Design a protein around this ligand. Structure first.
Ligand SMILES: [Cu+2]
Ligand SMILES: [Cu+2]
Ligand SMILES: [Cu+2]
Ligand SMILES: [Cu+2]
Ligand SMILES: [Cu+2]
Ligand SMILES: [Cu+2]
Ligand SMILES: [Cu+2]
Ligand SMILES: [Cu+2]
Lengths: 505, 505
């Protein structure tokens, strides 16, 4: 297989505004097919990317900066990965649909990137909910690390896997006061799992693993999950970073299709997390190890002072449908403390005052259940409340209303669930029978309410719902009314069809 | 039309070697179609480029550094510019879109020189008759100098180059390092190109000649005798600006235009100090108030902004294109603003020692005459010795041999000539009569021999042959043998058909 820690970790370029003034900042980002070096031991890797880079241009925004972005489609008409077509109306309809969603963004539905607000090359053909070309981002939210990715109806797994993903960092006058590592020591890390062929081209399954004969199934077929052979950080496969012996701020973002990591430093140094999806934690938390699921973001600090002239590997203890291989997916990247101290370097902590969030005075309680469904061909259809995306809206919160959502997971798998617009807070988890639900259907709890860990007590937009467990989440639906979405961020699950509309007002 | 001096002059990225060691340095450069910026007030333009950049990744090489480059074709199978099929004869199923990279001014073995008929389609699916190697080797047995790599595909060169396949290749020498010249941030490549864009931000290349009466009998599309662009780009951008410190800067000026020849001069009439030509450093630096720069000529120059702090000095042109120079447009190249503050001297010494004093008396004298005739349709074919590229070889220099070539220009045009593999030296120019020649066919000289200017006394690979004039140049054909080319580097002339093979036996 490919030799590890040979390619230098690329810092994704900051996006340059086409035009900028006090009133607003305008960007023009085009989606293109390009051929990029993933590893120096393979050939060119055809990828679909934002402005010719994987990850896409990192967009730097400030609280209440009117960031306008024209997301353009300059892709081939046909797709280079397997497109099943037995997922979604056979009145085809352009094959290559694209729409950009800013994950964790406080935006109006108009510029949120609705799955059915898609567009083909130069907007030649659009989706039913298409409205405008130039998306507006007012950024009325806390300092945090947001990421933009394709959300095209039933193509999200493929378009994201193809490389359509990038960083969107929001800075805040509060943030500047925290005396953290900045500039050269403030590095975004987009972790993705992938598989490549000998010819250096991408590989994405045409059928599920078992797949008896050609009996019943379509070709190509959607897979219930996808676990990659190799691990890429930002651009490159198992890369390295030359660091100074000092404190670094890494913005860790799991952008993988299904894979969930359990990251830890090879030296068992403490990984100090200062922030989650929504922004800074109530307090920084000493991790040692920690789990990171699709679309979760961990704003972290690691101190290399005292490991001067030493090699420290970023390791994973989380398998993917199989035991973690030490030679491959047990590794993420490698820090080498070789670069010298540019200047005198000491850096050292009170944090964000954590709002009271009283759930007793809520406006409504919802009980949402995760369930699996079968199809004609006899393969899993992952569903929310046993409801297909295309069915009538059930989740209809009022503009201003505060709701408590009880996510029940009877399934054997863990599911990271994500909600557009809002940043919710986790109340608690509670384990239930997972066996009488086989006979009856009524929930009964094995144990008492377990409050979330300190890193989950902050603002989250994507949360792990564990198996045989009910997790309660409170959210204040403010602001911007209109139609949004909530879904599971496992791409394979999201498409076909663990995704439902969410109507504010 | 376009508002000038609004876009920053970009500095083309240095190429990163795939792999490198003492024995060799290996690069993988792919040609791709991408959509760039170009100018804030025009939308993204579709371009063909090397590793997604215009210009291509500037490659930094050292004297005797084994440079191995894999030039790959990842282009569409059809071309986006006109393509006149009535120029070159078409073999079996000659694919549309042929590519081959030539390192202009490179001391390369024929195999790695990029022969016009050593072309290749996408991923080498189909090759040209003289195709041999997938990887090109560059041993770099030559002086410190400003080289550039560009497409030289048989009868497509004008289009493929216009589309943007052009990049810098810098040879550095141990006796270039001792010069104490401006280095790193203050050593800037400047690729000047003329272009025309449509309102939609797409490229425009003429489909026919300027005037056509009832489409006459002429074909569509037709190749034009010359191509003059309305807008001027430096490196990436249209009429850009450069924020400079008040000190000495080293600019490597390269005219990469189709047809257009510039007469550059600083608007403040500050001295432009040229230190080097095509082949390398001059015998002495020479002071230049204004100077003429023709396609494929390189001027290694130093400009001192020290005396002009806080001012705005524009780089101007006084050279028209089949038309009076327009002050609002093609009279301008770019704009230097001396606002950046001083990080961290007054020149250094006349320069490079070179061979003694045009000794001549070589093994062979050639008399090559430039001519123009007509075709079926009644448009100009430009030819060398009234010989088409596909006729038998007349220019066959022996491997050791030193030849003197007498280029006779009876033509009304200035036709600059380029020779592959060698770096020749100019003996002299001498104007004849032309009318005597056109009427009789005998050369008779109006005036005595005029020795070249001090900047032409060095090593050149492309030289301006003026009208009604004979120019003598001497060249030592070492150190490689095989099949090479010589031609006029006005691309439109080059393609139909002012190009001939040169055998080095
Ligand atoms: Cu997301
Ligand atoms: Cu989202
Ligand atoms: Cu799921
Ligand atoms: Cu979503
Ligand atoms: Cu050339
Ligand atoms: Cu050349
Ligand atoms: Cu010519
Ligand atoms: Cu040439």
């Amino acid at each position: 297989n490919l030799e590890k820690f040979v390619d230098e970790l690329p810092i994704p370029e900051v996006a340059e505004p086409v035009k900028k003034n006090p009133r607003q900042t305008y960007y023009e980002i085009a989606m293109e097919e390009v051929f990029l070096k993933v590893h120096r031991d393979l050939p060119p890797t055809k990828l679909w990317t934002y402005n010719g880079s994987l990850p896409g241009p990192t967009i730097h925004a400030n609280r209440n900066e009117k960031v306008k972005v024209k997301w353009m489609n300059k892709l081939p008409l046909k797709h280079f990965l397997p497109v099943d077509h037995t997922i979604h109306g056979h009145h085809d309809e352009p094959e290559v649909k694209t729409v950009v969603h800013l994950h964790g963004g406080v935006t109006p539905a108009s510029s949120d990137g609705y799955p059915e607000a898609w567009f083909s090359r130069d907007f030649e053909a659009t989706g039913p909910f298409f409205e405008r070309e130039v998306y507006e981002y007012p950024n009325h939210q806390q300092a945090c690390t947001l990421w933009y990715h394709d959300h095209a109806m039933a193509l999200t797994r493929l378009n994201v896997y193809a490389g359509l993903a990038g960083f969107y960092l929001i800075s805040d006058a509060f943030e500047k006061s925290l005396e953290l590592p900045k500039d050269e020591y403030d590095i975004p890390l987009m972790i993705m799992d992938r598989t490549f062929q000998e010819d250096g081209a991408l590989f994405y399954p045409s059928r599920p693993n078992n797949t008896p004969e050609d009996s019943d199934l379509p070709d190509p077929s959607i897979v219930p999950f996808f676990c990659g052979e190799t691990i890429l950080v930002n651009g490159k496969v198992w890369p390295y970073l030359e660091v100074e012996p000092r404190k670094y701020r890494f913005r860790i973002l799991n952008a993988s299709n299904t894979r969930t990591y359990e990251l830890h430093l090879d030296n068992d140094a403490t990984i100090l997390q200062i922030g989650s999806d929504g922004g800074f934690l109530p307090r920084p938390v000493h991790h040692q190890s920690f789990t990171i699921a699709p679309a979760e973001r961990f704003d972290v600090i690691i101190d290399f002072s005292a490991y001067e002239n030493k090699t420290i590997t970023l390791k994973n203890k989380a398998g993917c449908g199989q035991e973690v291989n030490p030679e491959t997916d047990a590794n993420i990247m490698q820090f080498k403390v070789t670069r010298p101290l540019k200047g005198r370097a000491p850096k050292t902590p009170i944090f964000k005052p954590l709002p009271p969030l009283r759930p007793s005075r809520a406006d409504q309680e919802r009980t949402l259940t995760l369930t699996g469904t079968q199809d004609k061909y006899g393969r899993p259809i992952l569903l929310l409340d046993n409801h297909f995306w295309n069915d009538p809206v059930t989740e209809n919160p009022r503009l201003g209303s505060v709701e408590v959502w009880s996510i029940v997971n009877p399934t054997r798998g863990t599911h990271p669930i994500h909600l557009h617009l809002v940043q919710f807070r986790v109340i608690d988890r509670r384990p239930f029978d997972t066996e009488v639900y086989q006979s009856t259907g009524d929930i009964v709890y094995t144990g008492p309410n377990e409050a979330p860990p300190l890193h989950e007590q902050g603002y989250k937009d994507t949360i792990q719902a564990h198996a045989g467990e009910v997790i309660r989440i409170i959210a204040r639906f403010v602001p911007y009314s209109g139609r949004y979405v909530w879904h599971c961020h496992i791409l394979e699950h999201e498409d076909y069809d663990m995704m439902r509309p969410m109507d504010i007002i």
